[PDB]
Design a protein around this nucleic acid. Structure first.
Ligand SMILES: Nc1ccn([C@H]2C[C@H](O)[C@@H](COP(=O)(O)NP(=O)(O)OP(=O)(O)O)O2)c(=O)n1
Ligand SMILES: [Mg+2]
Ligand code: NA
Ligand code: NA
Length: 318
DNA sequence: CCGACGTCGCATCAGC
DNA sequence: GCTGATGCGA
DNA sequence: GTCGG
């Protein structure tokens, strides 16, 4: 409905993050683009827009300019700027953030072609990002996510039948496609008071996991691909997080999302005397002092503690 | 007016 | 060599 | 850039 406005605010958001290194301004523009994306009328003026939470004076002014001229001078200008447009573009490679993109552009390295002929100036993550630049920008249809899930749940059970693994994120909520696969792993032997490596190893042995971005005792980030004389599947981003059993369901709730649904839930639990981080749910004592983590054995437990009726993953976009 | 705005695991760098 | 900081993508 | 104490 207001596609021109929300694209403009998303573009400005990227320049803030990537060129100006102004992360809070990036988040501001994104919040503004979001609140406007959901607004159920075609906007007529910046003043109409300013009524929304996240839209302030300068964005109301920007909308005014867009509506009257169909563009924004400042944006048109930065788009045409070689240095800035190249900086913003390089950050599309995974592992090249604002700072590595600035340095490349400083020394004349501006395009994927230039990155291709300068491998030795790329760290390991950035090579993998460049290798899969196009793949990493595709979404994953549900059907492939389900085949991916089949492999992961199978290999994980085969390594030790007492692992518990859950694929979270937009997939756990039932979305028709997904940007990545987030797997949450726990084992009854691991609580708060080798397990990851065994799983990653087995997924590599069956050639499901094809590259490693980073790997510690608790978190793996990397790349995987379904088996193929039909055209091969795109490489996909996979994360595997190993979480102590007593924190597993807080992890699951959180890494299931949505973004927005998380936020309300956290707020609802405040205005109920509980604090929910990704790890624990804790009570707030009569003056804001957090007490001990409360036992949690399922998602539902958390929902009870704060008297909300267990909400299905599919019903969690807010 | 003026500070918050999410917090953290891992890879790699910067300082010693 | 060791420790803390910073970049990055969550 | 926006919000709010
Ligand atoms: N800023 C953020 C980002 C993520 N999250 C939580 C909720 C998300 O569903 C979950 C995973 O983040 P995500 O993978 O970027 N988004 P999600 O999987 O829901 O959708 P897609 O990856 O399919 O685009 O972490 C959050 O609470 N705040
Ligand atoms: Mg996701
Ligand atoms: Na990047
Ligand atoms: Na990016």
């Amino acid at each position: 409905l207001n596609g021109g406005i929300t694209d403009m605010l998303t573009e400005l958001a990227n320049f803030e993050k990537n060129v100006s290194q102004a992360i809070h301004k990036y988040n501001a523009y994104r919040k503004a683009a979001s609140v406007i994306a959901k607004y159920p009328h075609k906007i007529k003026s910046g003043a109409e827009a300013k009524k929304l939470p996240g839209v302030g004076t300068k964005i109301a002014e920007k909308i005014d300019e867009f509506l009257a001229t169909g563009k924004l001078r400042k944006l048109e200008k930065i788009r045409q700027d070689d240095t800035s447009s190249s900086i913003n573009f390089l950050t599309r490679v995974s592992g090249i953030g604002p700072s590595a993109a600035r340095k490349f552009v400083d020394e004349g390295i501006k395009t994927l072609e230039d990155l291709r002929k300068n491998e030795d100036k790329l760290n390991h993550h950035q090579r993998i990002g460049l290798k899969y630049f196009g793949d990493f920008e595709k979404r994953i249809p549900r059907e492939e996510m389900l085949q991916m899930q089949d492999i992961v749940l199978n290999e994980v059970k085969k390594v030790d039948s007492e692992y518990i693994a859950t694929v979270c994120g937009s997939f756990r909520r039932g979305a028709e496609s997904s940007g990545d696969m987030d797997v949450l792993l726990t084992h009854p032997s691991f609580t708060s008071e080798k397990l990851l490596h065994q799983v990653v190893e087995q997924l590599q042995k069956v050639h499901f996991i094809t590259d490693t971005l980073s790997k510690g005792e608790t978190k793996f980030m990397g790349v995987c691909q379904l088996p193929s004389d039909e055209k091969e599947y795109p490489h996909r981003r996979i994360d595997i997080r190993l979480i102590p059993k007593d924190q597993y369901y807080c992890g699951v709730l959180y890494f299931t999302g949505s973004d927005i649904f998380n936020k309300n839930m956290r707020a609802h639990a405040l205005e109920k005397g509980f604090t929910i981080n990704e790890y624990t749910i804790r009570p707030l004592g009569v003056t804001g002092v957090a007490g001990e983590p409360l036992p949690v054995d399922s998602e539902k437990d958390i929902f009870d503690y704060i008297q909300w009726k267990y909400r299905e993953p599919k019903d969690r976009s807010e």
